Design a protein around this ligand. Structure first.
Ligand SMILES: Nc1ncnc2c1ncn2[C@@H]1O[C@H](COP(=O)(O)OP(=O)(O)O)[C@@H](O)[C@H]1O
Ligand SMILES: Nc1ncnc2c1ncn2[C@@H]1O[C@H](COP(=O)(O)OP(=O)(O)O)[C@@H](O)[C@H]1O
Lengths: 91, 370, 370
């Protein structure tokens, strides 16, 4: 299991919390090979992890955090308050 | 003073008029001012010397016709004042401009000076109690009953695609061209000269429009029709002489899809419809593709919708459900929605009153429209 | 093979070129490929049919201009290859690509596929001995003579605020938008249609850029300018007809600060500048505020720097010394830095040699840049 944690507390908090559980099957051969095989598994996993942890969040969080609340509305126009207070919808 | 308001749906080719809450515009006539070419020697002649509506349609040959409107933008303001005065006069409506509030229409992304000068005419020359200007795409959706969807339109002046989502007309995704029915009729006239039969006079121009209305179809594959040889179908003029039209009938409405023919690098109808959907947001695209509404007279060509479907299939992303709906009364779709908008009680809030115009001016008209 | 290296400063709007260790770029021309709209009937016409640089600027009206590069991301690769070939050809440089090493530039945080395909073009199609891609902000600081400071820039494609402190370009604190001069020119074009004067053609598009360059100013208080009525100043087009510009001139460059007006979510130039300073470490913020360098053509608006200073005063913490410095030649700031970087003896170590590229591939290019 592979857990990250980051915490920022200036002007309010932000936290990164994470983990990856991995189950793998390896075959023993030599001391030089088993030393360089497990490390290789860790190296690729932790890079793929950091890669996903960095590259998915910079883009996908921006879009999923946006799917919850969008940066501008569905019109892409700042909502008009005068319009809201003197318009009717429906049938 | 809250009388039954008048809905004047302005158009470059045809102008529609009538009262609020009706099923159809009772008063539809072409938007031009015919004036006599020849000299009047004999007494008991046609009096006035300024012809609008059915008199002008009856006596085309006498009148040097000239359109005040071009691409949804009035050039001749004195002529539009005479048309609006004729609309309210006893020959059509039989009412006063002083009593009823006015619903007006215009194309999107037009000159703001023309919108101000329109308001000046309705408030000062006519004595209107309250005015309101609106879009064509918003009204067409009110007529159908829907809220969401794209509205492709093709009148005589403008072709513009406006995407709307749940009663929110998206301003930044409004696509527009100055290629439309009048330009197709002008392109047909130029093609008929290449065939043989020329129509140079302004009264004689409406024969080309009548040929365009009747005998023009949009072929699905243009390259296949170009390789094949046409049949040369006939058409009888108002005189009686025959005209073998030939390949000009099918190459004429190609202008709307291929604007490179007239000599004007524009997008075209099908590209405008795709561009309007693409400029709008990712979440709304699939709903906008499913709800595509057609209106205007230049959508009434044979196999227009079938060609517009094929062009969307070519451009748009694959495996998406396309649906180009079209009402029965496409010519009057914009007026029906205005009549519905006028009949609703909320119309009182939206309009610009005469008192509010006198206090503020043009700024209040710009605020209330958007 | 260590000959005098060439510095090709890329850009969506304009592309600069010349030799290393020079004061000014001798070879500046706009980055586009003009192609003939009209039919060449007469013998002894313009030969070639693919126009780049001053010939295209001279013969705008004939050519359908199209840009290969939008937002620092090339769309059409064949067009950029023709532009780079025109740069190296006898009409501009009068040199071979085989002799001189190459210094390329790109906007930060771009797609890596385009950077790879750029390198492929320089190593394979041209036979370059050594290539090196670099940042624009790093070069602009080398041109000025500082090491510390933020570099706000605004070309035709990209706007990006890169903070650097004593030769440490922080890759993480780099902010970027896809909003710049081209989008301001497109937004001004849209406003001119709202005013009345429509420009749709590709050759006619460069008149809007010329109007944007000449007749524009950024107001300090936009709400105060909105309440007041404008003067409506004039400007003569290349033809001769006069145009009253009106309120479009001052509302057009507001796009850079308010990105919501075009219809796309972004931070803005002033926010990006504050944001680049905030993302860096706490101890280095006050030095980054003191050294703010401007660059690019879209920073040349009247009262642009004054508006940037006011926006920083509003957002940033109080009682901090703000200083937005700028060079005299803001257009050629990045190229001078590249010419300085190329003239240095260190330059031999940084580059990607042709032998190293043939052995490793794209991975060696990704390693050497960062
Ligand atoms: N059946 C038809 N086939 C082809 N074109 C038509 C047909 N009916 C009308 N038109 C064209 O469309 C125009 C009418 O468009 P209209 O719906 O009134 O739009 P607008 O209100 O914007 O003028 C006419 O001038 C005519 O040239
Ligand atoms: N004096 C000026 N005022 C306003 N805008 C300008 C001015 N000069 C150039 N521009 C705009 O800036 C662009 C040039 O910027 P530039 O830095 O050369 O772009 P790039 O960084 O892509 O090379 C032009 O396309 C033009 O629209």
């Amino acid at each position: 299991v592979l857990k990250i944690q980051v915490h920022y507390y200036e002007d309010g908090n932000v936290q990164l919390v994470s983990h990856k559980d991995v189950q793998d099957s390896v075959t023993v051969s030599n001391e030089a090979q088993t030393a360089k095989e497990f490390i290789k598994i860790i190296e690729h996993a932790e890079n793929e992890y950091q890669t996903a942890i960095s590259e998915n969040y910079q883009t996908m969080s921006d879009t999923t955090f946006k799917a919850l609340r969008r940066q501008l509305p569905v019109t892409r126009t700042k909502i008009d308050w005068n319009k809201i207070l003197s318009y009717k919808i429906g049938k | 003073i809250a009388n039954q308001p008048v809905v004047i749906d302005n158009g470059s080719g045809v102008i529609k008029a009538g009262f609020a809450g009706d099923q159809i515009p009772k008063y539809c006539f072409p938007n031009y001012v015919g004036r006599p070419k020849h000299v009047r020697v004999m007494a008991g002649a046609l009096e006035g010397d300024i012809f609008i509506g059915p008199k002008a349609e009856e006596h085309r040959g006498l009148l040097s016709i000239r359109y005040p409107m071009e691409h949804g933008i009035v050039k001749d303001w004195n002529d539009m004042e005479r048309i609006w005065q004729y609309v309210y006069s006893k020959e059509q409506l039989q009412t006063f401009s002083e009593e009823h509030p006015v619903l007006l229409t215009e194309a999107p992304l037009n000159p703001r000076k023309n919108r101000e000068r329109a308001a000046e005419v309705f408030f000062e020359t006519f004595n209107v109690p309250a005015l309101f200007i609106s879009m064509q795409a918003v009204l067409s959706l009110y007529a159908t009953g829907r809220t969401t969807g794209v509205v492709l339109d093709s009148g005589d002046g403008v072709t513009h695609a406006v995407p709307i989502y749940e009663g929110f007309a998206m301003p930044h995704s409004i696509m527009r061209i100055d290629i439309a029915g009048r330009d197709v009729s002008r392109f047909l006239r130029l093609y008929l000269r290449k065939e043989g039969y020329d129509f140079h006079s302004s009264s004689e121009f409406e024969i080309v429009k009548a040929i365009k209305e009747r005998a023009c179809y949009l072929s699905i594959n243009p390259q296949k029709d170009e390789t094949l040889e046409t049949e040369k179908a006939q058409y009888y003029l108002p005189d009686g002489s025959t005209i073998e039209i030939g390949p000009s009938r099918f190459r004429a409405p190609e202008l709307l899809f291929r604007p490179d023919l007239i000599g004007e690098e524009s997008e075209g109808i099908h590209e405008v419809l795709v561009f309007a959907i693409q400029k709008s947001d990712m979440d709304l695209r699939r709903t906008l593709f499913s709800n595509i509404v057609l209106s205007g007279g230049s959508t009434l060509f044979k196999g227009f919708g079938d060609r517009l479907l094929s062009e969307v299939k070519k451009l748009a992303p694959k495996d998406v459900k396309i649906r180009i709906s079209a009402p029965q009364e496409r010519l009057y779709s914009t007026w029906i929605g205005g009549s519905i908008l006028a009949s609703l009680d909320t119309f009182k809030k939206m309009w610009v009153s005469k008192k509010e115009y006198e206090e503020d001016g043009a700024r209040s008209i710009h605020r209330k429209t958007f």
